[PDB]
């Protein structure tokens, strides 16, 4: 039963109500950056004595806080932003939550219902400017229907296909004295009508059917599978079927495991996408065959039966068309073949041995690799040892770029929200912000941001926020001083032919610039700079035995490539396997 | 005539035909960060040896930038991002560029035409998500368009009322080559039979009536007076009539005249607004009547016949009814009464040297003013030190809060296009990006950016390009450890109850954080930090003779408060005079 | 209802457009391309393996052939009033299934397509989606242009024939031999029959004639015939039914046949809205 600090028969200002309103869907944080058509929702956080508010140094830095929250708990990510310049710096993550389905409620203020549309001070039409990149928005145009529309907001973005939904509240509402009703309904008729059934027995017989009478089966595991681990372990148990992950569903299954074909696509191992290249059966759960992922479609998994269970119907036949599908909750899929493949275990004698053989012999002769030049830092070994030294169970959050893909290569995750990235949008300046997030999400953790120096300093702002809130994020920085990704496509699709894409000082060539151990100084974060391979264990031991927050600053060679490369729009036989920029 | 580096006959890449078309646009300077939808325009870029590119740290460092070199020069700003998380940062700029009427164009990379609406990687609706904060937007479907698309952008950003235009480009567009058509007509036959005419003797006539039938004339100026410095300084010679401006036009007529009322609105001076109040005759030539100069609209100038000049007809009658109006260029409407003004002087005996006796009088009685504590440096006086030590000649971009509303009170700007600063949207982080563009379009100039801590931190990843470009620009920054205005309004209207205004470390409440020094010696830029009052005179002289980029850290008491105030949707007689926070 | 709709099938879908796959109901399997292809690589397997498949549903077919001769299309006749099932299956008759046949909207329209035996595809021309009134008369034109040699009828109610009757116009102006089977029953029959089953059968603005002249067949469709030069009759019993539509055929050019029906006939059988099988109706009208 719910305590509310009001009297039922007390009336109260929209903004007192909005914030019981969150603190009835057991709201615990908020990210939230003051301005003027929000303060007083400010007010009325400050009168709350459950909800704590993280504050940003930007709102860009404050959204995709919320996100690293909701990656790492699967809770939905709260976040509010002021009027004008504040909701616009929401964009970036909005269009970022909804292309990786993360679950996140945004609350702008807004200047008065009377003023809108006038040109007013600090107004921007945010619900026209967000429509396209949010799952729903809302203007509230009554201090009525705040407990309604925050009830909603809250269960479409959770619920189905979890995404980003913005509410706007003008600031007269938040003003205005009401008696609010929470036992109204919600005005979602449609969507609700169209949740999907819990899966049916005809259609995951006819899956374990298929399985049984294939002989190269192959999972494909995608961010869809990030509440179904425990589901997920027992379908592998039963059925042998080895399982390749995509960026956004690392962790789901083990990739330590002996079964696991850890991640496939364009940057993704050979043996991965070489089961996928030659199987006869493909079970796509939880993912929606990104281009990252398949590359030229019509090659793709083309001599596989391909069965799709996916929570949203619109994804079921959008890019390749399967054989068999399931529109539901693969969670509650899993469990209905689960049970299926333990009552008729003796039945069907289920062994892909020959085929997990031959992906052995592949795993054998095309592993993931990377050279030792000297005694300079490999970036793909210093990953290596943080998985070592935290024993795998550490959260990370990356930028985008190849230390992005060295990160998902060479850490090998236990557990799914273990790993936190920006995969669909691809938003540089995600990582330091996310693990702030993540470190709020859980206190107890390991949180490990691995990040570009290009990437880092877009949100470096935020090295503040961490000293205040005395979060112990470490920054794990990959320093090569250059833009690597386009770095790395300059040197293969256009002669190595420079476009600003060097971010050191050009005066100081071999100074390295900036000076990311000033700015940790600058906000108090205690710091440190290794350059030489011998040093880097006992240099990242330190980072993790230094409590509170800690930035290590790693130099790597800017000639490295990632590897392996499958072009975009390409074939498994266009694969790229050795390479890079020297 | 234009040179080409291509042949007439030779086929070029679309990314090489953007380019030209910017080159024949007289475009010397962009604003772009690189990412893949728009590797193509980065490689295109390197072959012109007319157009110099300055990479940002961020994309909202790069638009704000583009501002900056727009609104310190009058020529359009060219920013470029990729698409995706490239494009959704560039929204706050364009926002800001669209309330203050900024020429602007940015173009954006996109996925290839046929990847459009698949929820590609790195793809956001771009032109969806910026139709209501642009002037106008453009999604190029084919390579033969882009010399069409590209004038038609310049001459929408720059004619009529300025804006920023976006032109979003596809890659497979980029890649594809074409001989180009320069001399195609624009598809604009709208907007140009819309274009207004050149004023008309008739309505000029009638002002001029209007001004010999007076005896309290004001003017009020805005932004739409930049680039009639001359003429309105001709126009006052002939009239006598004392000048008010608004935020955004400072400059147009010399603020350190004898005839200046300096700003008027909701922090304007109390001579300034009084005039506006008892004026009989209200001359407004290229304003908006926005609500923080106006408040209650029934009440504001009530007892006087308004003149209204303005060239977006759209403007005129919109917030309040002017009896006689003009719909035009301010620049020519000036020019055609100055000849009148001039032809009949002797007839016409202007004389309102009672009425402007009357203002001096509150001039005397209410000045601008501020308190001096003990050896506490007032952040009025700091300004008001730079302004004698530039000699009034500095170009000064400002962030948003207590310290843009101090930089506008107490800094005598004698040209227009030395005031940056985002008035509309009134976004933060605005000014030290901006102080980059006009360090770029002014080479010779004095560049201050006068910035509060909040502001600053913002963006504070744009001293790394400072340094990298060599850009000569001053950092004044006004250290409060707080959020200054949304802090004021606490101790108005809330009690002065705390919620999420200060900036500092709680731990450490009497210790300065961040140590803003050291983000500046992390990019490698010589900074200061100044306290005692004695000291800052020698301090910002430092700043000034220092040859290249400078930060001087003056810290300021937390407890002042912006007058004078006219409460949000007052009157006259509801100013403010006298209170602070302590 | 959509749970309750095959409900015990595997489900194949052949749709053109994806978005069509899986919208209602999720099919076990699917394919998306032309169905006409599909059918054509069917067929090739279907004929190459046909004795390796046994294929024989005859035992099936014999369990529906039972429920056909149960619960066959049925209509009454009372006394010689004429029932608008019969006018359309004499036409049927005489034209021998091989007419283009236009519709309007409402109970003609399903009578239309229960009791006319449609031969072959693009004869069947009706608003099936929108439902729209007043499509039949100009729809009726537009085929007879397309196809010049064919005969083409509008059968049509009274409510839907006025909305567009100004095309009669150009009928003869353009000299179309469009044949108009006008079933008139002087009210909006579908509407009706739905307040006699879920609005205890009070009206509400659905008789369509003049309620001074109860008993008067209003409006006098055939002057509006006749006023576009076009020549008409009225048929009232159904003795005389046969040989006016033979007229109406035979005669050279455009014709109107004013057919008065019964209001009290219900469309069966019925199931209500969201129902299901078990909800069926068989039996009932307005009387
Ligand atoms: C620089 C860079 C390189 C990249 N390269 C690669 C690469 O090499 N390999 C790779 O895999 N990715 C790569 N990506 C990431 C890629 O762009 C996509 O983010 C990713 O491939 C798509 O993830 P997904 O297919 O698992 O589906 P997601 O984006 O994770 O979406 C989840 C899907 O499952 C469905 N779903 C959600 N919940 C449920 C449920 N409870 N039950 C059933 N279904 C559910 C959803 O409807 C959705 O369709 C890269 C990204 C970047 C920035
Ligand atoms: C914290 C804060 C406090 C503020 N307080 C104040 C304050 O106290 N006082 C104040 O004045 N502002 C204040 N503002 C700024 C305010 O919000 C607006 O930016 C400003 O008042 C509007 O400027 P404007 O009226 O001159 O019109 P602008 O926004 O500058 O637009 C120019 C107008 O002139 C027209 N125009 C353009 N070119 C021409 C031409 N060639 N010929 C004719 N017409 C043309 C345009 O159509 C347009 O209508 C504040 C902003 C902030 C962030
Ligand atoms: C220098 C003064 C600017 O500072 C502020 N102005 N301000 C307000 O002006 N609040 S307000 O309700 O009356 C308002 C009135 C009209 C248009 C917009 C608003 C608005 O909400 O802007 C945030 C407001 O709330 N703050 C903090
Ligand atoms: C780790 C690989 C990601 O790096 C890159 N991918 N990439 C591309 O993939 N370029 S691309 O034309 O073929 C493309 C194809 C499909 C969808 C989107 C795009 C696109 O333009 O994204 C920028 C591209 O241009 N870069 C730099
Ligand atoms: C905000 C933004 N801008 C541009 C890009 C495009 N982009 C860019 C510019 C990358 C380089 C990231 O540099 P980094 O130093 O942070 O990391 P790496 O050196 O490991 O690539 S990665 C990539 O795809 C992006 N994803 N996000
Ligand atoms: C991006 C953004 N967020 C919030 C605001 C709202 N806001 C805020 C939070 C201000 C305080 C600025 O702090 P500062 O330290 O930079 O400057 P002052 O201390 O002089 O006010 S000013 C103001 O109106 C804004 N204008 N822009
Ligand atoms: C233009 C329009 N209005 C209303 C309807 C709704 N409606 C109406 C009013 C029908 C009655 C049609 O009357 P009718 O005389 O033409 O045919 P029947 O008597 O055989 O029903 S059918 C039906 O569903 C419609 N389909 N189209
Ligand atoms: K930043
Ligand atoms: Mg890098
Ligand atoms: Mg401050
Ligand atoms: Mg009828």
Redesign the pocket.
Known sequence: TFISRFAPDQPRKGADILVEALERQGVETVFAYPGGASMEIHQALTRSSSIRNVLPRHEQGGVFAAEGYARSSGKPGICIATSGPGATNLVSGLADAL???VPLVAITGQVPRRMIGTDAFQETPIVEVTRSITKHNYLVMDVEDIPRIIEEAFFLATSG??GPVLVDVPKDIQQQLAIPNWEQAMRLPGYMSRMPKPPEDSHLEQIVRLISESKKPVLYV????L??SDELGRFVELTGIPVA?????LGSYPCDDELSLH??????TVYANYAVEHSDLLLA??????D??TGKLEAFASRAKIVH????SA?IGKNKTPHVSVC????LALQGMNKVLENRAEELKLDFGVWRNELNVQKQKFPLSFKTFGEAIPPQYAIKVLDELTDGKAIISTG??QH??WAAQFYNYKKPRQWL????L?AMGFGLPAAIGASVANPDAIVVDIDGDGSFIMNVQELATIRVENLPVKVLLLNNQHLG?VMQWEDRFYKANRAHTFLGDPAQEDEIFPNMLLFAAACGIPAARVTKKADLREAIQTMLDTPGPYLLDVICPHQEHVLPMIPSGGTFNDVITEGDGR
Do not use: A, W, Y
Not at 328 to 331: F, H, L, R, S
């Open positions: 292309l990786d389905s296909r979890p995608g961010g869809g599978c509440n179904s992950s995509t960026l956004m569903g991640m496939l696509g364009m940057h993704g759960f939880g993912v929606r065959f990104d990252r992922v269970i996916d929570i949203d994804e539901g909750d693969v969670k985008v770029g992005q893909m990235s920006s995969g669909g691809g990704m």
